Design a protein around this ligand. Structure first.
Ligand SMILES: CCCCCCCCCCCCCCCCCC(=O)OC[C@H](COP(=O)(O)OCCN)OC(=O)CCCCCCCCCCCCCCCCC
Ligand SMILES: CCCCCCCCCCCCCCCCCC(=O)OC[C@H](COP(=O)(O)OCCN)OC(=O)CCCCCCCCCCCCCCCCC
Ligand SMILES: CCCCCCCCCCCCCCCCCC(=O)OC[C@H](COP(=O)(O)OCCN)OC(=O)CCCCCCCCCCCCCCCCC
Ligand SMILES: CCCCCCCCCCCCCCCCCC(=O)OC[C@H](COP(=O)(O)OCCN)OC(=O)CCCCCCCCCCCCCCCCC
Lengths: 239, 354, 353, 240
């Protein structure tokens, strides 16, 4: 499977913030989306997710163009989304956060949903916290429960939003473990973040976007050794 | 989708119930403050409390369309500001399913509203406005303001108070012909309906010869004034048209149609009590539209304030458009149809832009 | 001095907007009330604009203090939420200096209302009433006669056949009982400027009334109709149009209490600021808007507690001297307590250490 | 050469002891960083030092002057500045007006003195060319320079920055560091709390790590990066 966003473009009130952005995400490939805050980076990320309607360009999940479908159809073709803020169901148990989404899936019967719930509880080591309200969870376990909930919908690409924002330097070693686990299943994780050091570490291909245009692309070495990025985004003294 | 429906449903239902509790609560208080002005003599602060309280079921039925609006706003914003609706949408759940999930408890809410406004509100309102009518005004011929006046060319009549079982009280009547000899006058006491004719008791009909003679009062405990107005009609005429039940409004509308009198004021109340579920549905559709749009990320205070402001404009509109159907000749159905339709159209448009 | 004309500009603009919205809402409500009586025919559908134009000063004077209250709340909450006041406090600006900055527009809003209450509202209430006497169905509305009895009930308003002519009706029922005009028939000799009074070729003017079980004998009368004017009775006593000067030295209790009610709104503007500078503070979570509604209920309580005491002062119950003055006191103290709550708490802390 | 001497601080929220017996000290011309896990008392300690949270025990003492019980305008009149994390510029006021609205509160200057101080602050931070632009039309970089010039206009002895390296590009921090170095050169002591450990540990000179209320380590970057307890509870075993 491949998520090709082609020739994206979007004009805000008066000015145009995105101009001819073309990304390509494959399955089992971590891709990072980076750039200066003022430029159009979160705009491209949201236009891929579906919250912002583009003006040009197409979004295709393996010859399944969804450029006009809302977030409903984008998620039904298979696209995850994990908000930066806490999105746990506060008054629902942990064993019910996953099940309220497993009940949405149609291909699963009564036994299949129970088996999937058991597998998802065992995979992410939240089996002993299966009877705690969402508001009773700490920051460390909340993210694991949210990731399990996201996988309960059986997506193909999960589009994380700000995973390394405001976390301790010791919890990034666990977030990266979860991301590696997600990649090991055949998912097309897409990370956008303001934290360059860890995003360029975990990711395999980064799309630096400035002034609503791609100025660079490639692995970490081909990004940290470029010249436009060193001039505008990273600065000449960045490591 | 069972677990999600119960979570969206319990949340909006507890909130609508809490908002109706505060609104019925403030409104009963503003009403007591007003009643206190007239508590004097016959009416006592304790008695006023029975009227403010037994008129509660009606005050609630009126506020259900506003309580539903504000409660839906609050109970869906408490899920939208926690980012628990973007998760539902990104899991494959459409907006139509969320709207239906919110509507399912509200369909039960409007059923309960119909049942109360048809079977409980008339009874409690009638008891309250009969007790208060008896208390404030049993004693004197023209003193009470809850009294009923009827018209004949020859005579004009005032009855101080009426009771549902049959007992009647306080009647003063003046009968004038073009000639109008002041032979008799009318002031009266209790009038239990006695067969065909109300029996005016202890009448001080003032008896005089106009050109040159003295006036004397004769009281008869069996004196009878025959019934131009029968007892049931007497129950309906005193009651405010909004307080009558639908099955009573239909009968009174058709009765007035038979006699040729104008019943256009009684059509507006009928339509309001019948089309109320559709108005509640339109209001909650507009509220759901607001949550998905402008008020997705605002705080609780802004949502409550927005709700009140829109709600006020609605009520005032329904009060501009209501009695204007009689001043300007257009059907009274539009008076209730137009604002709900406008709210529904605005909600549909704002949902379409998403 | 630059912060002075920042906080005395945003507050004024927000007050203007809020006052406009409140004026619109109150005008609409009074319009719904008056429209219905017209459907019954008790008022002129065509004269519903002059009354709303003449009643603007009263609504404006009762709204402007609330406009200032909500304007201060919204503007200072906006400054608090954008961290424009955290850096003002962190530079030396006190909380007794914010009040001094805020009482500059509260002095202009308290001159506007002190003028609307003393020199403009009486004239508007006076002309509005005059027009009711100039008109008030002066011609042709007597009621196809539909039975009509006045709220006062002294005077009953009626004609034999909703006669627009209202002349020589077999029964003219304008009858006013305390001594009641009784009209055998009423020729329409009317349209006097003071009120419509119609000659009865024969008017009993039979003063005795069956209500007291008494009959008193009187014969023919002319120019009978009195002023059965409902709207003026509904909202205007001469006290609401009497000039302020006349109110000054009078011994009628009503005239003495009205001066106190009239000069009780300039003072409301000031008490309200003391209650809005302290409560304006907001966390980013609570927002500018959470408290705007609880405030409206407190303002309404202020207006109603005072109204109730005015009545007690003219009924002879509370000595004039004490007046409405106590009510302002309870609000000034609720206001002082909100203001100095914080310093007090901290000072208590100094002692516990 | 003043000093800030927040000592024996303590605070409790709803029974639990958020902060318990933490002691800090800042000097004039010194940059001190306050770091720790998010759930620890780092933010609480910073706020009780600033004055937005009232402590239950301990004394804050600037140069033998108990400012513990003072409101956050007697703390700031003793020489303690503050700079909130979010944008705190006067949106509808010019840059010159942003500085002068605070210069006018000074009782140590006259009209000429205020004008010369305004010119000096306007030319020192290289914002002289934007002296007439409204505060709402300033970029993310010039906004911080205007805010810091405004804060210096009150002539403090200590500026307590809050999250300076918050959502800024790697090229932007090279300028915030120059501004902090200028503040240190002038004589102001700076206290910095941030979630970005690398940059803060680089810029500062003596960092206090707060975990579970109490201090767990103190010293320069080298002695903090090589401590077993902070590498066990805060930085992990792979940091640098
Ligand atoms: C003759 C009859 C006269 C009746 C007069 C009644 C007057 C009542 C006036 C005072 C009402 C105060 C209500 C205050 C509500 C706001 C306070 C609040 O925060 O409520 C939150 C509460 C939360 O609900 P919770 O208990 O947590 O339930 C969760 C279950 N999973 O939410 C709640 O559940 C508590 C609030 C319940 C509100 C109940 C009142 C509104 C609904 C009934 C309206 C009246 C109906 C009248 C007709 C009756 C006919 C039989
Ligand atoms: C925060 C602000 C809170 C403001 C509260 C304002 C309350 C205003 C109440 C106004 C009542 C009123 O206008 O009616 C007058 C009436 C007088 O009646 P009374 O003195 O009992 O004598 C008559 C019988 N002989 O009634 C009275 O004034 C006397 C009885 C008052 C009973 C308590 C009223 C409480 C109202 C809700 C609070
Ligand atoms: C009459 C007074 C009614 C006042 C209603 C105020 C409602 C304000 C809601 C918040 C507005 C807002 O935040 O503005 C942003 C929003 C654009 O945001 P977005 O739609 O997400 O793109 O901009 C908007 O979309 C504003 C949408 C406003 C819709 C108002 C609908 C009012 C319906 C009233 C019905 C009355 C019926 C009787 C007449
Ligand atoms: C009546 C119909 C009048 C139709 C013409 C005027 C319509 C005005 C509607 C304004 C509604 C604005 C709103 O709801 O959004 C909040 C508004 C903007 O908020 P934002 O810019 O997002 O900042 C946060 O935040 C604001 O700054 C709002 C400021 C404008 C004033 C809003 C209304 C204040 C008065 C409310 C009165 C409510 C009813 C009170 C009734 C009892 C009065 C005693």
């Amino acid at each position: 499977a491949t998520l090709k966003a082609q020739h994206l473009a979007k004009s805000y009130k008066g000015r145009q913030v995105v101009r001819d952005v073309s990304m390509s995400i494959d399955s089992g490939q971590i891709v990072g989306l980076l750039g200066p805050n003022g430029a159009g980076k979160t705009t491209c990320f949201y236009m891929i997710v579906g919250l912002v309607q583009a003006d040009q360009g197409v979004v295709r999940i393996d010859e399944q163009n969804v450029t006009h479908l809302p977030m409903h159809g984008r998620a039904r073709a298979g696209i995850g989304y994990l908000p930066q803020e806490a999105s746990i169901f506060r008054k629902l148990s942990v064993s019910d956060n996953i099940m309220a989404i497993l009940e949405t899936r149609s291909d699963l019967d009564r036994n299949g949903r129970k088996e999937a719930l058991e597998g998802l509880l065992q995979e992410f080591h939240i089996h002993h916290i299966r009877d705690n309200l969402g508001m009773s969870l700490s920051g460390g376990e909340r993210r694991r429960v949210e990731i399990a909930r996201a996988l309960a919908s059986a997506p193909k690409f999960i589009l994380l939003d700000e995973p390394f924002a405001g976390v301790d330097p010791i919890s990034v070693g666990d977030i990266k473990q979860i991301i590696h686990h997600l990649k090991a299943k055949g998912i097309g994780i897409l990370i956008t973040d303001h934290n360059v050091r860890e995003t360029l570490d975990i990711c395999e291909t980064a799309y630096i976007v400035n002034d609503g245009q791609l100025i660079a692309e490639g692995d970490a070495e081909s990004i940290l050794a470029n010249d436009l990025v060193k001039e505008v985004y990273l600065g000449h003294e960045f490591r | 989708m069972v677990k999600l429906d119960r979570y969206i449903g319990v949340t909006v239902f507890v909130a609508i119930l809490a908002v109706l509790g505060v609104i019925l609560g403030l409104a009963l208080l503003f009403a007591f403050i007003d009643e206190l002005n007239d508590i004097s003599a016959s009416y006592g602060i304790g008695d006023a409390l029975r009227f403010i309280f037994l008129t509660a079921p009606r005050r609630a039925y009126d506020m259900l369309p506003m309580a539903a609006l504000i409660g839906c706003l609050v109970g869906l914003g408490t899920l939208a500001s926690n980012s628990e609706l973007t998760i539902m949408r990104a899991a494959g759940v459409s907006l139509s399913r969320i709207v239906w999930a919110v509507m399912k408890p509200m369909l039960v809410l409007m059923l309960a509203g119909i049942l109360v406004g048809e079977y409980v509100a008339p009874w409690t309102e009638n008891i309250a406005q009969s007790g208060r009518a008896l208390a404030q005004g049993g004693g004197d011929s023209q003193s009470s303001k809850r009294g009923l006046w009827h018209r004949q060319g020859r005579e004009y009549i005032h009855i101080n108070a009426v009771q549902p079982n049959g007992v009647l009280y306080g009647v003063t009547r003046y009968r004038f012909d073009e000639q109008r000899g002041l032979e008799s006058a009318s002031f009266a006491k209790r009038a239990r309906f006695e067969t065909d004719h109300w029996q005016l008791e202890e009448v001080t009909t003032t008896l005089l010869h106009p050109r040159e003679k003295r006036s004397e009062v004769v009281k008869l405990p069996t004196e009878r004034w025959d019934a131009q107005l029968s007892p049931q009609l007497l129950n309906t005429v005193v009651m405010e048209p909004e307080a009558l039940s639908i099955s009573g409004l239909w009968q009174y509308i058709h009765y007035l149609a038979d006699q040729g009198l104008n019943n256009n004021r009684y059509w507006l109340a009928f339509w309001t009590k019948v089309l109320q579920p559709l108005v509640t549905a339109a209001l909650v559709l507009m509220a759901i539209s607001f949550i998905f749009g402008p008020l997705r990320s605002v705080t609780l205070g802004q949502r409550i304030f927005t709700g009140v402001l829109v709600g006020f404009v609605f009520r005032i509109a329904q009060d501009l458009l209501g009695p204007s159907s009689l001043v300007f000749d257009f059907p009274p159905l539009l008076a209730v149809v137009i604002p709900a339709s406008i709210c529904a159209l605005a909600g549909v448009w704002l949902l379409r832009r998403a | 001095m630059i912060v002075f004309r920042y906080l005395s500009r945003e507050v004024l603009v927000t007050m203007s907007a809020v006052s406009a919205v409140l004026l619109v809402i109150i005008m609409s409500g009074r319009f719904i009330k008056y429209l219905a009586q017209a459907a019954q025919g008790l008022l002129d559908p065509g004269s519903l604009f002059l009354i709303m134009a003449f009643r603007i000063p009263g609504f404006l004077q009762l709204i402007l203090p609330l406009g200032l209250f909500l304007g201060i709340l919204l503007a200072y909450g906006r400054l608090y939420l954008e961290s424009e006041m955290t850096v003002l406090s962190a530079t030396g600006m006190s909380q007794k200096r914010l009040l001094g900055y805020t009482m500059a527009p509260a002095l202009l809003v308290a001159i506007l209302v002190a003028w609307l209450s003393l020199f403009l509202a009486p004239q508007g209430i006076n002309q509005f009433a005059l027009l009711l006497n100039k008109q008030d169905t002066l011609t042709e509305f007597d009621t196809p006669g539909r039975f009509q009895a006045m709220r006062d009930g002294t005077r009953v308003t009626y004609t034999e056949e909703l006669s627009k002519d209202r002349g020589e009706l077999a029964g003219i029922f304008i009858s006013q009982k305390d001594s009641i005009l009784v009209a055998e028939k009423g020729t329409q000799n009317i349209q006097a400027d003071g009120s419509r009074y119609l000659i009865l070729h024969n008017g009993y003017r039979y003063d005795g009334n069956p209500g007291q079980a008494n009959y008193r004998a009187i014969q023919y009368d002319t120019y009978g109709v009195m002023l059965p004017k409902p709207e003026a009775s509904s909202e205007v006593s001469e006290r609401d149009a009497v000039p302020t000067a006349d109110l000054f030295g009078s011994d009628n209790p009503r005239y003495q209490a009205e001066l106190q009610w009239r000069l009780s709104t300039p003072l409301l503007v000031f008490v309200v600021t003391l209650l809005a500078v302290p409560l304006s503070r907001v966390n980013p979570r609570q927002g500018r808007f959470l408290k705007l509604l609880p405030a409206i209920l407190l303002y309404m309580g202020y207006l109603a507690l005072l109204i109730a005491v005015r009545g007690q002062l003219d009924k002879g119950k509370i000595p004039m001297a004490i007046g409405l003055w106590w009510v302002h006191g309870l609000f000034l103290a609720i206001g002082l307590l909100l203001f100095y709550w914080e310093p007090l708490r901290l000072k208590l802390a100094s002692s516990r250490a």
